[PDB]
Amino acid sequence: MLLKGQRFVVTGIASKLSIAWAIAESLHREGAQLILTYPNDKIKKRVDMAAEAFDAVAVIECDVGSDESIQVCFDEIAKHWGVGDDKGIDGIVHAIGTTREGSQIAHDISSYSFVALAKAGRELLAARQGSLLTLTYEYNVMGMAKASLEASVRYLASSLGGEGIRVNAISAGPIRTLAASGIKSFRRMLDVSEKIAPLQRNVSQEEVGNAALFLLSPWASGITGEILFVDAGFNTVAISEKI
Amino acid sequence: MLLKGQRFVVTGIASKLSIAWAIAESLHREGAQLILTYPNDKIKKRVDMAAEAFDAVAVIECDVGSDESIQVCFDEIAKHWGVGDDKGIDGIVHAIGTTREGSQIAHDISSYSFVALAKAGRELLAARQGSLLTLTYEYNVMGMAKASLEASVRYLASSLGGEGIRVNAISAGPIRTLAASGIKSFRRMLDVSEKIAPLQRNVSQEEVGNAALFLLSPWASGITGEILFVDAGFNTVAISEKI
Amino acid sequence: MLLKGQRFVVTGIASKLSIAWAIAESLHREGAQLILTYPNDKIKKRVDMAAEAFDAVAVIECDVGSDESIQVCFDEIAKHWGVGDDKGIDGIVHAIGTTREGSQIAHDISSYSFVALAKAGRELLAARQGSLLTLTYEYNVMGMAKASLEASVRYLASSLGGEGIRVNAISAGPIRTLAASGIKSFRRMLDVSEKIAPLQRNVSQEEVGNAALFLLSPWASGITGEILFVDAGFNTVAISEKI
Amino acid sequence: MLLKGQRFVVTGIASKLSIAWAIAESLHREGAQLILTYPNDKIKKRVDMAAEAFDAVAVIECDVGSDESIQVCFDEIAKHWGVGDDKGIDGIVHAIGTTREGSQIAHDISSYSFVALAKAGRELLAARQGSLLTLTYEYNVMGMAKASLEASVRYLASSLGGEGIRVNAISAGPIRTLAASGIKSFRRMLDVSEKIAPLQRNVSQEEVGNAALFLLSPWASGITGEILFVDAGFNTVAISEKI
Ligand SMILES: [Ca+2]
Ligand SMILES: [Ca+2]
User: Fold this and answer.
1) Where are the domains of chain A?
2) Residues contacting A47, CB < 8 A, separation 6+
């Protein structure tokens, strides 16, 4: 089992659009032990389900919008995993998601929050030379925040790399989810990108979770600063031809 | 075992600089069955070693400089793997490597040869919806051929993707090899890139073989058209600071 | 004269690091008529100098940190240039420039403010099919905002392009300025990038102003969505060799 | 006049698809003096027209497929411009344009030929610190050669930059030409890219010639290693929406 005895903080299971569930599943499946976070005791029920399914070591409240909340969270993770001979974290997964305030809010929750976790997790990640992984999704001021987030990956890979901490991102294609499906205008992106993308389909959540597993695993120990597109080739694509 | 019963043509073991050995090792290690090629009955000895170590199903002469040689090779692979109920190939690995003739020769051996294998392997790759993987290395007219090769990855991912064939590349950092080491001027790139790269080291061959395994494996089934840098973050790096 | 009778709002002359002065100079030199903005009646003196040197049609207070300030500014520009048979603007130049608040503030002033001007200027820019130009500079959370800003260029080029409005950016290399010079640690970037860059020098402000002129001029009428590096080749550069 | 007394070798007027004509026109218009080349005394008539229209200082046979032909050409240009107090060249314009042989041929004529001219022109370009400009066009093994050519721009900018020689490329959008128009399948790219591109049109030859003028002119003296897209924003574009 690829991750026997390895420890991962997974943040974002509260959202049905995040793919964090599939990442947790992929990680669990290979023997990792997981601590999952919930942003709000209002949105805790889905996380408890995962906790249940995945044998979560703990379930800790973390709102990635506030440094203090993050600090408290990491104080708690430190209690579980920041003691012992074999103290430390193998990975931290960040899988979260107009006026200036809309922009400000996008950048804060989507982009800065990743730097915020990296800071809070550095000591523990350093202890086991673990990695950070963020997700990005493929139209608004979320384009600006996407770009922002991907730039933090390069800065962080460079600033954390001296401690042996890898930092990487997956860029996920459009995925067909329930509910996401019943929008009828998101439905229509999926219809189109299925025809656009080289593989002529949309990626599954399983494909994203397995790519995430890879980046978080020993197999990816030579890889840092990377944006891995998991999108059936959508991003690389070129011209309509007859559409 | 991730690749139980999966079939991979690995081309380039003849070169001590290719990393093809480590890729074969990584693949074997996870239960794949391998057919390795040699460019010349003059350079067959190293391949026979690998054949030996890896239990190669066959060892077939292929000079990636000639379409006919490639055709013959694929006629032979067809005999082993192009018959049965479960006919087909899971992957083909292309891990090969001033006047206009030097440029012409670089482009031919380094870049076009990859398209040449894709063509020859399409039917078999289609049969099992398998993938193609090429390697690129990180200064000459090899820069031009690198760029050429990476562009073929996007074209091929797009042209082959309708058949369910994925097409991807790894871009490998400077690696410290024996002999490669005793050059004393390549030695010095390695010295520098170790200080440059975020992780403060050069990647190992193991790291490249495992990243290759990943891209060739079911875990990467949502990924096509990708250039995966395996280089300890070298490529992403930004400014000297105090060097 | 390339810009006879053309109208340009230039924002950022208040900063001695912005290069907005040189852009204004370049524009004036070719016959454009200019309205320059100042963020604060505290920082108005430098702008009045330029107003003086360049024959500014007006000098209007604009703080790019507030939508209302921007609105008022554009109400005023509308009074000068939003009436007549030949109403409209030929260009708008945006040449402006750790905790989450530092990030928030960088993104707001550096990145969103550009979208804010585009919105406020759209009607007038549309009237003459004019363009927007922003500047970017080449290490902090300013990397994240840089990336953010450059992504707004693509979104805006796409959203404004149906009205015939072009949207482009210059990315400026390290420039040797007075004061900027007397920092002794910025001094040292300049020393290094002079040795790094292909041309073996740093670009002048004149070189940036002339590239800006170009992008704002009829000569660039086929160009939108572009990031033009004006940096003596610094960005494109590859490996130390012997440093 | 921006180019009074400046000297430019323009190669590619023989082709009706090259846009070299418009570049020559743009250059002439600003007072440059031109030497135009023809690949073949069979395809000399169009060049003589331009020679006529533009007051060409000479008209010299150059087949960019052969080093010797290029050498002879440059021996001749040396006779006109490689003597005097003010010896040298202000610019050289390279505006030229399946089996392995098709690939080999694409790379040779499209990509290496640019390096070949740079070599032959270096001494003269150095003498006046002039620049090189190549064109690229926007599906075959021409994609591979495009990528190849753009990589030569970075290598050459870096290798020639110590002599004060700038090296840049324009990437031109689909242009509606006569004849090119009467193809009925190229016609249809133009129809589509007009709807795709942000500006909702295809660029003109005038727009490409003026962008070329810029890069070759003193205004672009801070710019090297650049790929300038002149394509009404086509390249930057993102997703169909409702097509
Ligand atoms: Ca990548
Ligand atoms: Ca560019």
Assistant:
1) 1-243
2) A13, A14, A36, A37, A38, A59
In angstroms, how far is the first alpha carbon of chain A from the final one? 46
Q: What is the CA(B121)–ligand 2 centre distance, in A?
A: 37
Dist CA B213 CA B240 (whole Å): 34
Backbone angles phi, psi at A132, to 5 degrees: -110, 140
D123 reaches B (C-beta below 8 A): no
Distance CA C29, CA C40 (A): 27
The H or E element containing residue A123 is helix A113-127
Q: Residue C105's CB: how many other CB atoms inside 10 A?
A: 16
> Under 8 Å CB-to-CB from A228, ≥6 apart: which residues?
A168, A169, A170, A171, A211, A215, B223, B226, B228
DSSP-derived 3-state class of residue D164: coil
Those residues with Cβ within 8 angstroms of residue B210's Cβ, 6 or more apart along the chain or in another chain: A218, A219, A220, A221, A222, B26
Gaps in chain A following residue numbers (C to N > 2.5 A): 97, 138
Q: Is residue A108 within 8 angstroms of chain C, CB to CB?
A: yes
H or E element that contains C143: helix C142-160
Of the candidates D20, D43, D59, D2, which has an alpha carbon nearest to the alpha carbon of residue D177?
D20
Phi and psi at residue B7, in whole multiples of 5°? -120, 130
Distance from CA of D150 to the nearest CA of B (A): 8
- Please name the residue of chain B whose CA is at the shortest distance from the CA of residue A199: B161
What does the longest C-alpha to C-alpha distance in chain B come to?
A: 62
Contacts of C51 (CB under 8 A, 6+ apart): C36, C59
Instruction: Reply yes or no on whether D112 is catalytic.
Output: no
Closest residue by Cα to residue B29 from C228, A219, D99, D67: A219
Q: Which of B143, B243, B234 is CA-nearest to residue B190? A: B234
Q: Which residues, in sequence order, are CB contacts of A97 under 8 Å at separation 6+?
A: A15, A17, A18, A109, A110, A137, A142
Whole-angstrom distance, CA of residue C3 vs CA of residue B153: 45
How far is the C-alpha of B179 from the C-alpha of B183, rounded, in Å? 7
